Amino acid sequence: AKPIITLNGLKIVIMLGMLVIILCGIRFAAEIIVPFILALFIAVILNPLVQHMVRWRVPRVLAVSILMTIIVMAMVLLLAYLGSALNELTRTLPQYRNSIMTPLQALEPLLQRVGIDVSVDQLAHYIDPNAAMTLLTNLLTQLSNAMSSIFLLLLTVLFMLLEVPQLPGKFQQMMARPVEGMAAIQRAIDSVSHYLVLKTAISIITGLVAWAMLAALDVRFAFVWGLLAFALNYIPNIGSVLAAIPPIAQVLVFNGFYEALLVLAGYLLINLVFGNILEPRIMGRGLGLSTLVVFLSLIFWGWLLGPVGMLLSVPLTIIVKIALEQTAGGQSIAVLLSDL
Template sequence: MRKTMVTTQGLRIVVMMAMLVVIFAGIKSAADIIVPFILALFLAFVLNPLIVLLGKWRVPRALAVLLVATLTVCLMVFLTTKLLMTLNEFARTLPQYRGLIAAKLIEIDAWFHWSEFSLTPEQLAGYIDPAFMLNLVSKLISYLSNAMAGLFLLLMTVAFMLLEVPQLPYKVQQLSEDPGKGMANVQRALDSVTRYLVIKTLISVVTGLAVWALLAVMGIRFAFLWGMLAFALNYIPNIGSFIAAIPPIIQAFLFNGFSEGLILTGGYILINLLFGSIIDPKILGRGLGLSTLVVFVSLIFWGWLMGPVGMLLSVPLTIVLKIALEPTAAGHKIAVLLGDGPLKR
């Protein structure tokens, strides 16, 4: 009898895993449709607290959604336009970088004479081709231009999602076999994801502003670009902030001087320690319920499945998946593997 039960449980787990594979394969094949929808959904999570706040001030929900959507459109258009202008300027200066790098390498030519390296500065400069970076920047400019074209549709989707929020409890009750438990799980998922996204967005904004201010004070070019990069990559757990620091630090060492490069490196370390290692964990705490390993693996998995948007939203997507798996017998075991401790049932 016990052997039969174990076999049944094993079969359920296999079936659950097979269902997940089919679902993920469908998401991968339909990424062009699903990714904008997912992005709109999580943007609605971030904006909904503002709608609730305006509701407490007795602003009608439809008017509150209109005000927030209008403000968001204006902010996105301003930031995207400014970013496109900075990227275009950056692209125009890229061809000059090879000559500047060669000049810097010639300045340290004496180091190559007594070291074991056989490469000369001229040979090293020959390996530096700005065409790759120029191609990358061109693709980013094209991506942002296309995003501007789809911005109106994205915000319309967000607005309709925000208007549908009051009807969500009724719809969940109609779909669930156990309305009370189903709504409790949905509410827990909404609360967890909203809390994470709102706090992470605020921390990312402050991080981006701190980086921009540091670069602007030091007189390093493209401060706005690197500040926006710090803001965006701060959503990526574990490695995002470190990746965002690499380009401006290299730029500072090459074109501003060794001392400026060291100062900027120290500034980035201080910002990342303050926001990434102290403020972020203290505010978010262990409320996510995900192990550190799962957070890192989810970054790779969702990035492969949905591209850059998946990397930015890897943590909230994993939270939703974990909460969705918890109520079922087979899914509960998978949820335990994703969590950072015993689950409360």
């Protein structure tokens, strides 16, 4: 045309440029956004419990206070247990590394082979040691420095729970159609709140069941593996499969094959019954994240929000999808994120 800079071109480019600026803003302010978001989600999870406890005619402030003391004591105790178990695992690591190393040496002389062993040696180093080394580093930096920030986060959660009673009056007194599209009678947090409550119930059930079954199969670190399964259950399909690995690795490299197969059968039973109780119990909607979008959101949020961004990705992407579902212009993106 006569001008090359079409006004629609300007709209597109301004939108993209300002989105880039916003993302660099979030990536830069991650150390607030992450604790605040996570505190918000924990508050959402714990609010039904506190509300029911109020239904037992218990003072609100008293209830939340005792609940927070319970939670913080449990976290401190769990940090101690994790420190002991983790150190034991660190000092026990290389023995079964060599135990699984030996079959590689056995299988190296394939008839009419052309490659070398040392590179596959490094790949095995990736398999047993290196992934264990990275998990070691991440978890140990957690138990080392986290207590400086876990306390802060719990404080934030306490304040949110305390102030919840006055919040409905504040939303009611403030129409502002954007905010009613975020969380009001036009429920766009009650959607995510229910999902979080149900998913956390399921994850607790899965973690406890896995821990109990592992104890029934007398494997070491049964509790840590149960915790890991619980934590990873939040990522819908990748998380459970990824969590099922380390126990299988331990049981196979220590005990053998038949028991490892039985343990994997146990995990399959767990994840199928909870592939068959999560959907029909409540949340028949089956909140619409296609597996691809789950993985992509995982990578995305974990890249800008940092590691814990990975843990809270899926709830956060659900939030974004719900918010853009009702916006007039953006409904296209919202249906793009959905599943069918």
